[PDB]
Amino acid sequence: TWLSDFPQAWAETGGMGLAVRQAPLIIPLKATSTPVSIKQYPMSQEARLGIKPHIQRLLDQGILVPCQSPWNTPLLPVKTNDYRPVQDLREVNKRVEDIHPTVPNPYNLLSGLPPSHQWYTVLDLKDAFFCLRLHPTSQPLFAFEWRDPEMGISGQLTWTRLPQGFKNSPTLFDEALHRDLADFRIQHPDLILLQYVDDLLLAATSELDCQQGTRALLQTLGNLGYRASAKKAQICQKQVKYLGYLLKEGQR
Amino acid sequence: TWLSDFPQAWAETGGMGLAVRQAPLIIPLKATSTPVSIKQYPMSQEARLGIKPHIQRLLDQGILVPCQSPWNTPLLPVKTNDYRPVQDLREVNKRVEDIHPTVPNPYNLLSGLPPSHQWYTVLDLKDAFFCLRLHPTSQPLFAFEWRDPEMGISGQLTWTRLPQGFKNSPTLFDEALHRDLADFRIQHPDLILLQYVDDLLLAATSELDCQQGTRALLQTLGNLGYRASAKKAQICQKQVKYLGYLLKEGQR
DNA sequence: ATTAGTT
DNA sequence: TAACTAAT
DNA sequence: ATTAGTT
DNA sequence: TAACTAAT
Secondary structure (H helix, E strand, C coil), X not given: XXXXXXXXXXXXXHCCCCCCCCXXXXXXXCCCCCXXXXXXXXXXXXXXXXXXXXXXXXXXXXXXXXXXXXXEECEEEECCCCCEEEECCHHHHCCXXXXXXXXXXXXXXXXXXXXXXXXXXXXXXXXXXXXXXXXXXXXXXXXXXXXXXXXXXXXXXXXXXXXXXXXXXXXXXXXXXXXXXXXXXXXXXXXXXXEECCEEEEEECCHHHHHHHHHHHHHHHHHHCCCECCCCCEEEECEEEECXXXXXXXXX | CHHHHCHHHEHHHHCCCCCCCCCCECCCECCXXXXXXXXXXXXXXXXXXXXXHHHHHHHHCCCEEEECCCCEXXXXXXXXXXXXXXXXXXXXXXXXXXXXXXXXXXXXXXXXXXXXXXXXXXXXXXXXXXHCEECCCCHHHHCEEEEECCCCEEEEEEECECCCCCCCHXXXXXXXXXXXXXXXXXXXXXXXXXXXXXXXXXXXXXXXXXXXXXXXXXXXXXXXCCCECCCCCEEEECEEEECCEEEECCEC
16 A cells, blocks of 8 residues: 555654754744753652653653753643643743744635645644754753652753744744755645645645655655654545645535 | 892892793603602611601792602612712603703813903802702602601602702703803803803903902892802902812913 | 612 | 622 | 633 | 633
């Protein structure tokens, strides 16, 4: 299937992602900004156990690393009864320099969809932000304290990739992905590609230009280091669900 | 003094007032209006005793009279620990046809005060509304229930003069007083007269044109049936207190 | 005694 | 979304 | 655990 | 002038 011909393009078969052509991002602070260090809130054993596995996997993939930073924000337990780690980065958001909100809202994104393109492929990239590297100078910004009493493990960890919870993560990825798919857009003039952060839509007039496009797009995302979710892929269809909207023939 | 030469013009010496040249007023209702009859609220003996004297005086002067009406509004006790009668006429106000608010606000009234008139006389009429008669067809509107258990006196009373609490009483009096002092305004072109309901101000350039005006005005108010309060009169002065404002030379 | 109107 | 101030 | 924001 | 809902 589509899964056999493109092993590299799917998170199921391709491994962890990594945008190899994108330089590590530098995060500029405001002109008056100084490091803020919030002490970790005491966490229950239940949450600490629920979260510990996610931390260890991240350390193993190298997405998380030991560090020592004058910045520190609190880790939160958030529950379905599974505990995800959720860094509260608002005090870091407050101190980072604003960037233009270049990402269009869904509505406007769809307006630029001609009606002659009724064959749809919808992909969503898996763990998009973690594919973008973080420059070592900007990594200390996102440090949190990891403290596993029942193991003697206390110390700070921070991120090597674009983190969850950072106000600029969605815009910076959308821009990064636009850079990487600019050449694809030029090699396929008759195709339409909509990008909403980690949510893509390819549109053609024939189910064949679509097949030939989805192949090309999957080929390209895999070679650039991105991974689509095959579980949610909607390939060469006449109606698809994109950004809440259901697109059938042209309606909506 | 001014009190000896004008006995008729002062409430102190002139008796109860009565605008003899003004026909009894008819009060038109709205087009959809029907009589409303609110039952008297049970009143304590303390209030009933505090209010009883005021009622009896009013019956004696003929300002209050027995009647039988499909209209009825509640009497209230209001306290200084003296109990005044206060008819709640809002449900009657709601059903009476609106009239233009021709009375100007103090501020605008004063704007038309030239600076060459720095000699002031300020009068305020006593019980102004009660000087205006009420047409017998409009009297039932303002009926209240008077019930003195410890005397066997129960039954309805209503007003023969413009009542307190009626939304149109101030405008209708101001208009009535303007009609009555129109000729005075013509016989004294060099005088300035401001009227705010029951609050008058005469203004001249000399303390003599003022004396000769105050005499003429007192003469006129007395013959028309109005009564000024001598206790509060401010006669031929260079500074006076009118409608909150203090008028001295021309300032304010 | 009711009620229009207000952070 | 909690009670007053004034008004008649 | 905090907090921005809401009749 | 009384507590929430979601957000990180």
